[PDB]
């Protein structure tokens, strides 16, 4: 008989799924609501509790994914999914759901560690269902929870004031964690041992929650994979008023006052807000006009509720959750995936510095390098060789360092300096599950670690013995971290803590410890951005 | 001067109306709100208390009737009204009102028994104003209250889950009873002696309230006239999701999720939902396609709030309050009115068993008889004789027994076996107030008892002397039941209690007691349905 | 390869279909446009010539049926179709199409007689595709053409003046005939020998075309089956402005002037006008209010273009240039189908005269009998018997006589006295293809002859030798009439011409001539209506 669990708001019916090598079937629950559908007047407001239900709710079908560009969303899902076949998902404003994968025998009491995944997608696209927690849950005996949160306009529209503070998507993540605290024990999980992990915008979300007083007792370990609160493209600093007005005008709304704009946008249909999203061209590199006025994403803002100050200031006052924190990046963060998705204008293979400077200026929204500083930045990375082909690869390294590498090390250093256990890694491997459209030379591209973390080798076909072992090792490290706040364990390479010696783990075919990740880069950039 | 009464929410102004034969004029109050208008966000949600008003509210005009097919509603009103002239009513979603007829002298303190009427109409049409309480009030010295409740989509739309549980119309009936308990004393009524009564869908509603915990202390006597919770066509069993989706699609709504459907439907205009209602062609026998898929009514469901389980489960569970209960039926419940209203195919008047079986299959939504059982059921009723004209008559008896006769006796037996006082009657009389298009041979058609219960002979012109005595006797029985929970009285024929001897009263030109109502019919159907 | 024919407007591709027993394949062409789609400004205007197309138009799919109540239209199609399985059709205002079934060898020059079918449906519903001309075409070697024309509001809305004369549906029928004349030769048909035939409203349409100057020289023989221009329910006399205003108001249009109502109605969407149709409750006996205000149909009006005066006036004038005309009726025109479709109130069997008179008054829109004349009419038909069951049978005969019987004979007599060949028949047979809901005792019900005329026994299953022979005979009579304007032929029962002896053919299991059809009834009614 299928598994039936009693939650605070009512009973839920899931399904058993067996994985080769494990006797105990994994209980899976899909589409459990953790908040009230943010429809009508609830749009652009904090999430409210879900209404209780009578009888048994069927939790065996995948929930819709929050409204987003349908094509872009399906593409990212197909590129990141760890399951054999990508499942098509429907769009809906009614998307505050979470999926649960528990390997615990529900007929007995269990208090397994809980790993709550927050998906990436630039806060504009993505879905929880893209990630199958079956393999991780079974292999490491942890309860895996995938959550969804409002995206794009619905999750991050901000007027910069009290009429629409913003960060609705982050408040949804907090609401999901609150639900986990109040209900996860019913699924064999330990509410006292919750780890939050995410990649890209998901990693940024983890970083933000670490800095938020609203997430105080909702987690005990954090993992940010390729993305932190210092990844500037995802955090809006300064006056956010101009963007709110552009969105309102594009939707056909007056901009008389903030309250007027929000009231008008609240009357728009889902389709109308989706059409506004498309006209805005989010997540695409605008090669026209002043680079400084382009906004490829709607994201995190300093609202005063979730975040009281900028991430940089919160780090200085060392005011944030000092729980164990693992921060990592991939060898080639800007190697293919991101530039492909953003229609980046790079297609030759050989790049001259003159062209590089022009491209770097157009990339302002991604790297925010004043035009007066472009020459230095470019000469610094490309000036050491006239091999136009090598200049091109060094150019991609430059973007990667500014977006993920440097921000990640700075975040880790500040966390370490607050006295909290810290760990770092650099992932370098090319999964066989890579897209056929991606050249073989790209190793450790954005998102490549996902196939290891979610045990893709055990759900998809064609993985080599090497890739299989890499996944087993990565999952064991992550799960050891989830239960102990330290990834180390018997039979695993030693992973030094990120202390004053700045040790970190180089993960790949040949996994080994090293020290001083991106040291010279942090020095260079911190100095350049100070000018 | 006009009658002015103080209610919890404010003062109300009524009007005096005298009925010859009685010196004390009857105070009449029309359109008193008992809940907040279920508009906008309140559509598909439980009734909220009415807001208080200042000064004196003029209760001298008939309130609108809840949105419904206007042609069908006006036709039913003209066919069932007990007044000289049918009163044309306006349609509106703002329809949660009740009318009061009190014979008490408001200058003194009175605690007369209260009779609350719940009108019928398949939960799709109907109105309170159709029934004038003047005669009953004045003749039997009881306070008569006629209530309205949401109908059709507005009153019963259900997604099968927490986003729209359903039974909004029944919740309104409960709300009206709560209002009576809190305010009726001001109108000379005794909140400690409330009798709920109704016929057809109204009778089914009374039966439902008897089974609902939400109304446990809201009434002390109950009367179900031609309709109970076991009248299957009014109660939906199993998954109600398909019907919800069909309605949403017809209204031009997406069916992505339950929350999405309800939200879209809450956005539709009253006119848009009325057009959806008309396109669904409710309350009409569908002769095309599979009979098992037709839905003539939107009604009661097992929501978890009003009903925690099916009436059958509750009955066996003996989980219902034991108030005195009068349950009755008419000699020919399916004799003319219902078949006429539902457009039943019966032009020829004759009927061979082959045609009979086909019609019975098409009547699946009304009788729910599996196709493989049709021959047995048909042979049972028509196989006794030839003369296709007689067979068609037995065919109408078959439908009547399945929809009203058997369900009523079964409910009566269960109530009796719970230790509660129970009474039964079979009304067999043809009122002169019947439609002119109705054959003189139809006696005791559905609704025929209403003219006697509401004293039409004293409000309408041209009643026969025999009809006048019949009404006086019927009102006496009903009013006696209201005050003592026993219909018996001086000058009235003896009405036996429905005990193990199963005595009941045959009401008509000649009124006398009898025993074992529908005994054999119940045995036959219980067994046939047991297969 | 598939058959390809060259028409005035372009090439068309059909399909070859072979009927059992006939080696010459029938070339079938479905959905050939004979007019420009009556959309936008073309609504409520005369049909315009179809626009020519390049290359080859694929005419292999059934065209949509003109906008109409979809449930009513689907039901009728199922009840009248001669094919094995009913073909579900789409609704559309783009419906001016015709289907062609030609048994001619297109590789050779042929000039076969052409029979053009005009479907019935009260001018409110119906479709051409319901009728498969395969059997008729193959068995009698005639080209069968089934046409469509605008229905309901779209085909007959009239303001009574030049802003919307009306009869758009009849103008469509005329345009189809004009198309046949200009194109049929290419399909092996003789434009010099066209026979128009139709049943019910289609029969009335044929009758109207015989009386219209617009249709002269467009056909050479006519057949009206159960319907003529004197069937008053289909012809509106007097002022039609009141009905136009009711339709405009229901549709939410102002009634300031005729030009304004029409302009507004033309701006409504197809769905809005269909909703108006549903709200109007057409084709249903209105049991409410004054029966003289009822309007169950939107039909023929005296526009001044199609009809210059009432059919009654045109008959005397002997203006209608002559052509051979066959006029027929069925034994029980009001036996089951029509009463069933119109929701006629006849649940019970037997009927008393008092009730009969009330029903006859409510039937005013169908029979047009002044209230002071109801007693006489009723006594004439029912006053000769006490058995109320028979009074019910006789009552149905009365309605049938006033609607079809008398009007048909009067038309035949007038045609005869105009000098043209005239023939009459009375069909008395119960098709095995009848609906299972129709009592076995109904014989010669409205539409019963259709199955014989269209060779249902050769397409559907179950037909007995007797039913098969009847169809062969009927198709033979019909085709001979189309060939020679005289149905008689070798091996067929003698069919006398309808002359001063008023001979007519009684068609059924036993077919033979007789004389003076409805003679006594015509005298009675002519005298009664003269009062
Ligand atoms: C491309 C992506 C960024 C989505 O973008 P988006 O929400 O659709 O917004 P965009 O402005 O980029 O729209 C681009 C348009 O280009 C066109 N296009 C063509 N080929 C395309 C491709 N391969 N990828 C994306 N867009 C494409 C489409 O017409 C699309 O228009 P649409 O709105 O009608 O679907 C990507 O699919 C995303 O899902 N991946 C995750 C990115 C995340 O990791 N970044 C974090 C910080 S960099
Ligand atoms: C017929 C009745 C069921 C109302 O139905 P409804 O809400 O209009 O829905 P329907 O699908 O039946 O509509 C039928 C259509 O048929 C046509 N019609 C023809 N003759 C009719 C008739 N005698 N009565 C009703 N409708 C008729 C109308 O055009 C109507 O169209 P509309 O929707 O534009 O008004 C009835 O009038 C009702 O008011 N009486 C009480 C029934 C109750 O006792 N039954 C409880 C369970 S058996
Ligand atoms: C019934 C018929 C007249 C169609 O009517 P209509 O265009 O739907 O308009 P109506 O007012 O009759 O609608 C009646 C309603 O009653 C209900 N109904 C129930 N049983 C029914 C039945 N057996 N037949 C017809 N309607 C029925 C339906 O809910 C229908 O609802 P809808 O309007 O939303 O579809 C018939 O189907 C027609 O197609 N046949 C041709 C009749 C023609 O030969 N007669 C000419 C002389 S009058
Ligand atoms: C599909 C479509 O648009 N419907 C049309 C079809 C298509 O030609 C065929 O289906 C091939 O696509 O047939 C017609 O063109 C035709 O018979 O003349 C009319 C019809 O409206
Ligand atoms: C639960 O939902 C699934 C997916 O729609 C369905 O297949 C299954 O039958 C449902 N179980 C029940 C009966 O609730
Ligand atoms: C013609 O239309 C039919 C529609 O069923 C289609 O199957 C066919 O491919 C089309 N082309 C031709 C002319 O064969
Ligand atoms: C309230 O309205 C009624 C209805 O017209 C009217 O008769 C009455 O006088 C009004 N109230 C007063 C007394 O002003």
- Report CB contact under 8 Å: B256, A39: no
Of the candidates B93, B333, B426, B467, the residue annotated as catalytic is B333
List Cβ neighbours of B430 (8 Å cut-off, separation of 6 or more): B440, B442, B443, B444, B445, B448
Contact A27, A16 (CB under 8 A): yes
The C-alpha angle with vertex C493 and arms to C490 and C497, in degrees rounded to 5, equals 95
Secondary structure (H, E, C), C363-402: CHHHHCCCHHHHHHHHHHHHCCCCCHHHHHHHHHHHHHHH
**DSSP SS3 for A512:** strand
Q: In whole angstroms, what is the distance from residue B266 CA to residue A40 CA? A: 10
Q: At what angle do helices C168-183 and C201-211 cross, to 10 degrees?
A: 70
Rounded to the nearest angstrom, the distance between the alpha carbon of B42 and the centre of ligand 3 is 36
The most distant pair of C-alpha atoms in chain A lies apart, rounded to whole Å, by 71
User: Nearest CA of chain C to the CA of B291: how many Å?
Assistant: 13
Among A65, A66, A67, A69, residue to substitute to test ligand 1 (most atoms within 8 Å of Cβ): A69
d(CA B30, CA B373): 50
The single residue of B93, B446, B452, B502 carrying the catalytic annotation is: B446
**Cβ atoms within 10 A of the Cβ of C159, count?**
26
- Give the β-pairing of C56-58 and C26-33: unpaired
State the maximum Cα–Cα separation within chain C, in Å, rounded to a whole number: 71
Q: How far apart are CA C302 and CA C309, in angstroms?
A: 6
Q: How far apart are the first and last CA of chain B?
A: 66
What is the distance between the alpha carbons of residues A191 and A180, in angstroms, rounded to a whole number? Answer: 7
Coil/strand/helix, residue B398: helix
What residues of chain C lie within 8 A of the CB of B279, using their CB? 275, 278
- Of residues B162, B128, B136, B129, the one with CA closest to residue B44: B162
Q: What is the DSSP letter of C320?
A: S
Cβ contact A200:A213 at 8 Å: no
Sign of CA dihedral A320, A323, A329, A333: negative
Ligand 4 center–CA C459 separation, angstroms:
25
Judged by CB atoms closer than 8 Å, whether chains meet at B345 and C278 is answered as no
Query: With an 8 Å Cβ cutoff, are B257 and A54 in contact?
Result: no
Rounded Cα–Cα distance for residues C85 and C130 (Å): 10
Whether C349 and B440 lie within 8 Å, measured CB to CB: no
Residue A219 · residue A196 · CB < 8 Å: yes
- Closest listed residue to residue A283, CA positions, set A159, A92, A123, A93: A123
Q: What H or E segment, with its residue span, contains residue A199? A: strand A189-199
Strand partners, A515: A503
CA gap C169, C197 in Å, rounded:
16
Contact predicate B464/B451, CB 8 Å? no
Three-state SS sequence of C35-86? CCCCCHHHCCCCCCCCCCCCCEEECECCCCEECCCHHHHHHHHHHHCCCCCC
CA distances from A191 to A132, A175, A194, A482 (A): 21, 14, 6, 12
Cross-chain Cβ contact B347/C336 below 8 Å: yes
Q: Which of C93, C225, C333, C426 is catalytic?
A: C333
How many residues are listed for chain B in this entry? 531
Q: What are the residues whose beta carbons fall under 8 Å from the beta carbon of C360, sequence distance 6 or more? A: C367, C369, C374, C377, C378, C395, C398, C399
Can you give the C-alpha Rg of chain C in angstroms?
22
Whether the Cβ atoms of residue C261 and residue C253 lie closer than 8 Å to each other: yes
Backbone phi, psi, residue A173, to 5°: -65, -40
Chains C and A touch (3+ CB pairs under 8 A): no
Residue nearest (by alpha carbon) to ligand 5 atom 3 = A60
What lies within 8 Å, CB to CB, of C448 at 6+ separation is: C330, C427, C429, C430, C431, C434
Q: What span, in angstroms and rounded, lies between the C-alpha atoms of A345 and C15? A: 55
Chain C residues in contact with B435 by the CB 8 A cut-off are: 287
Which tokens sit at B316? 């066996």
Residue B159 C-alpha, separation from nearest chain A C-alpha, in angstroms: 12
Provide the b/e sequence for A200-213 (b: ≥16 CB within 10 Å): bbbbbbbbbbbbbe
Q: Is B387 exposed, middle or buried (0-12, 13-18, 19+ CB in 10 A)?
A: exposed
Question: Which DSSP letter does residue C492 get?
Answer: S
d(CA A19, CA C370): 83
* Cα–Cα distance measured from residue A381 to residue B35, given in angstroms and rounded to the nearest whole number: 73
Asked if B244 and B261 count as a contact pair (C-beta separation under 8 A), the reply is yes
Chains in contact with C, counting 3 or more C-beta pairs less than 8 Å apart as contact: B
| C1 CB within 8 Å of a chain B CB | no
**Inter-CA distances, B260 with A265, A274, A338, B248, Å:** 18, 16, 33, 10
Closest CA to A198 of A227, A155, A219, A160: A227
Catalytic residue among C200, C207, C212, C294: C200
Q: State the Cα angle at C353 between C349 and C357, rounded to 5°.
A: 105
Task: Take residue A327 and report the two structure tokens written for it.
Answer: 């921060």
Q: Residue B182 corresponds to which tokens in the numbers above?
A: 């809190």
- Both tokens of A78, joined, read 């197909």
Question: What is A1-53 written as a DSSP string?
Answer: ---EEEETTEEEE-EEE--TT-SSPEEEEEEEE-S----GGGTTS---PPPP-
**Integer angstrom CA distances of residue C288 from C277, C284, C292, C340, C372:** 18, 11, 11, 18, 19
Instruction: Write out the two tokens for C191.
Output: 């434009």
- Pick the residue from chain B with its C-alpha nearest to C338: B347
Q: What residue segments make up the domains of chain B, in order of their start?
A: 1-531
Q: By three-state DSSP, how is residue A224 classified?
A: strand
Output the furthest CA–CA distance in chain B (Å, rounded): 70
Chain B residue with minimum CA distance to A58: B161
CB-nearest to C348 from B275, B345, B439 is B439
3-class DSSP assignment, residue A391: helix
Tokens encoding A305: 């509720």
B297: tokens are: 């009514």
Q: Say yes or no: CB of residue C298 within 6 Å of ligand 3.
A: no
C119 an active-site residue?
Answer: no
Q: Could you confirm whether C200 is annotated as catalytic?
A: yes
Q: How many beta-carbon contacts under 8 Å exist across B and C?
A: 110
> How many residues would you count in chain C?
531
CA distances from C69 to C92, C204, C223, C275 (A): 11, 21, 28, 9
Listing DSSP states for C325-370 in one string gives EEEEEETBTTSSHHHHHTT-S--SS---HHHHHHHHHHTHHHH---
CA angle B360, B366, B367 (to 5 degrees): 60
The helix/strand/coil state of A174 is: helix
Helix, strand, coil tally for chain B in percent (to 5): 40, 15, 45
A positions 4-63 inside 8 Å of B (CB):
10, 37, 39-41, 51-55, 57, 63
Q: Is C442 on the interface with B (CB under 8 A)?
A: yes
The first and second tokens of residue C136, run together, are 């008729």
Q: Among all residues of chain B, which has the CA nearest to that of A55? A: B304
Question: Residues 6 or more apart from C520 whose CB is under 8 A from it?
Answer: none
Residues in CB range of A512: below 8 A, 6 or more apart: A493, A505, A506
Q: Enumerate the β-bridge partners of residue A71.
A: none
- Parallel, antiparallel, or unpaired: how do β-strands C143-147 and C97-102 relate? antiparallel
> What is the C-alpha separation between A316 and C116, in angstroms, rounded?
91
Nearest CA in chain A to B258: A94
- Please report, in angstroms and rounded to a whole number, the separation of the first and last CA atoms in chain A: 66
CA-closest candidate to residue B299, choices B122, B80, B106, B515: B122
Q: From ligand 4's centre to the CA of C191, what distance in Å?
A: 26
| Measured distance CA(C13)–CA(C7) in Å, rounded | 11
Burial pattern C401-421, b for ≥16 Cβ within 10 A else e, equals: bbbbbbbbbbbbbbbbebebb
Q: Burial level of B260, CB count in 10 A (0-12/13-18/19+)?
A: buried
Q: Are B107 and B266 in contact (CB under 8 A)?
A: no
**Eight-state DSSP code of residue B86:** P
Q: What is the CATH code for C1-531? A: 3.40.50.1820
A331 touches chain B (CB under 8 A): no
Task: List Cα–Cα distances, A404 to A356, A399, B159, in angstroms.
Answer: 19, 8, 47
Residues of chain C positioned with their CB less than 8 A from the CB of B437: 287, 345, 355, 358-359, 362
Both tokens of residue A307?
């975040």
Cα separation, B161 vs B239, whole angstroms: 10
C-alpha separations of C176 from A344, B320, C118, C157, C194 in Å: 61, 69, 10, 20, 12
Distance CA A62, CA A66 (A): 12
Contact status of B313 with chain A (Cβ, < 8 Å): no
Identify the residues whose C-beta falls under 6 Å from ligand 4.
Answer: C 30-31, 57-59, 61, 63
C446 noted as active-site residue: yes
Nearest-CA distance B354 → chain C (Å): 8
Q: Do B348 and C359 touch (CB under 8 A)?
A: no
Experimental technique used to determine this entry: X-ray
């Amino acid at each position: 008989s299928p598994p039936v669990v009693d939650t605070v708001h009512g009973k839920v019916l899931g399904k058993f799924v067996s994985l080769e090598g494990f006797a105990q079937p994994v209980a899976i629950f899909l589409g459990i609501p953790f908040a009230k559908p943010p429809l009508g007047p609830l749009r652009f407001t904090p999430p409210q509790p879900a209404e209780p239900w009578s009888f048994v709710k069927n939790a065996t079908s995948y929930p819709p994914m929050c409204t987003q560009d349908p094509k872009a969303g399906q593409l990212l899902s197909e590129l990141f999914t760890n399951r054999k076949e990508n499942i098509p998902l429907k769009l809906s404003e009614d998307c505050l759901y979470l999926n649960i994968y528990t390997p615990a025998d529900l007929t007995k009491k269990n208090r397994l560690p809980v790993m709550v995944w927050i998906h990436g997608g630039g806060l504009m696209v993505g879905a929880a269902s893209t990630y199958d927690g079956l393999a991780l849950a079974a292999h490491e005996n942890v309860v895996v929870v995938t959550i969804q949160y409002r995206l794009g306009i619905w999750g991050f529209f901000s007027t910069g004031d009290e009429h629409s503070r913003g960060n609705w998507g982050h408040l949804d993540q907090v609401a999901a964690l609150r639900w986990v605290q109040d209900n996860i024990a019913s699924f064999g999980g330990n509410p006292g041992s919750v780890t939050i992990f995410g990649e890209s915008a998901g990693g940024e979300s983890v970083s933000v929650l670490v800095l938020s007083p609203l997430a105080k007792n909702l987690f005990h370990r954090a993992i940010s994979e390729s993305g932190v609160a210092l990844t500037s493209v995802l955090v809006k600093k300064g006056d956010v008023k101009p963007l709110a007005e552009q969105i309102a005008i594009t939707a056909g709304c007056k901009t008389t006052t903030s309250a007027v704009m929000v009231h008008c946008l609240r009357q728009k249909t889902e389709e109308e807000l989706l059409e506004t999203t498309l006209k805005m061209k989010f997540l695409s590199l605008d090669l026209q006009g002043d680079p400084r006025e382009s906004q490829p994403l709607l994201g995190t803002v300093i609202d005063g509720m979730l975040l009281l100050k900028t991430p940089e200031e919160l780090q200085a006052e060392r005011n944030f959750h000092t729980v164990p924190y693992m921060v990592g990046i991939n060898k080639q963060e800007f190697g293919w995936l991101i530039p492909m998705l953003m229609s980046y204008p790079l297609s030759e293979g050989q790049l001259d510095q003159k062209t590089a400077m022009s491209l770097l200026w157009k990339s302002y929204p991604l790297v925010c390098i004043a035009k007066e500083l472009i020459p230095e930045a470019t000469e610094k990375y490309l000036g050491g060789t006239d091999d136009t082909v090598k200049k091109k690869d060094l150019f991609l390294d430059l973007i990667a360092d500014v977006m993920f590498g440097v921000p990640s090390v700075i975040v880790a250093r500040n966390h370490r300096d607050a006295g909290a256990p810290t760990y770092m890694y650099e992932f370098q491997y090319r999964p066989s599950f890579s897209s056929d459209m991606k050249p073989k030379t790209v190793i450790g591209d954005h998102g490549d670690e996902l196939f290891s973390v979610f045990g893709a080798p055990f759900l998809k076909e064609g993985a080599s013995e090497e890739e299989i072992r890499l996944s087993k090792m990565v999952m064991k490290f992550w799960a050891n971290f989830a239960r102990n706040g330290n990834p180390n364990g018997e039979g695993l390479p030693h992973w030094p803590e990120y202390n004053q010696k700045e040790g970190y783990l180089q993960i790949g075919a040949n996994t080994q410890a090293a020290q001083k990740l991106k040291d010279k880069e942090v020095a260079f950039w911190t100095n350049l951005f100070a000018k």
